[PDB]
């Protein structure tokens, strides 16, 4: 991973239902272990991401909301 410990990311969150698709996420997430902590944040209308991209990968977290059928989208 590039991030040499801790990946910063704040993840866009697109759909009609958000509280959905955070619920869906959130659950999927919390599933994977080495976490360390994140917020979804409805004003921002993105989630900030803070985790070790070599325990857990950031293409997975979007994975979880993407497959979903939402869009979300990674940004720093």
Same mark, same amino acid.
């Given at each position: ?13 697109? /759909? ?5 698709? &955070?619920? +869906? ?9 080495? @976490?360390?902590? $994140? ?5 921002? /209308? ?5 985790? &070790?991209? +070599? ?9 979880? @909301?993407?497959? $979903? ?8």
């Amino acid at each position: 991973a590039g991030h040499m410990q801790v990946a910063t990311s704040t993840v866009r969150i697109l /759909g009609m239902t958000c509280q959905s698709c &955070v619920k +869906s996420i959130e659950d999927r997430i919390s599933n994977l272990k080495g @976490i360390i902590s $994140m917020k979804v944040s409805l004003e921002q /209308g993105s989630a900030t991401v803070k985790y &070790v991209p +070599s325990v857990v990968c950031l293409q997975q977290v979007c994975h979880q @909301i993407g497959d $979903m059928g939402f869009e979300a989208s990674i940004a720093e």
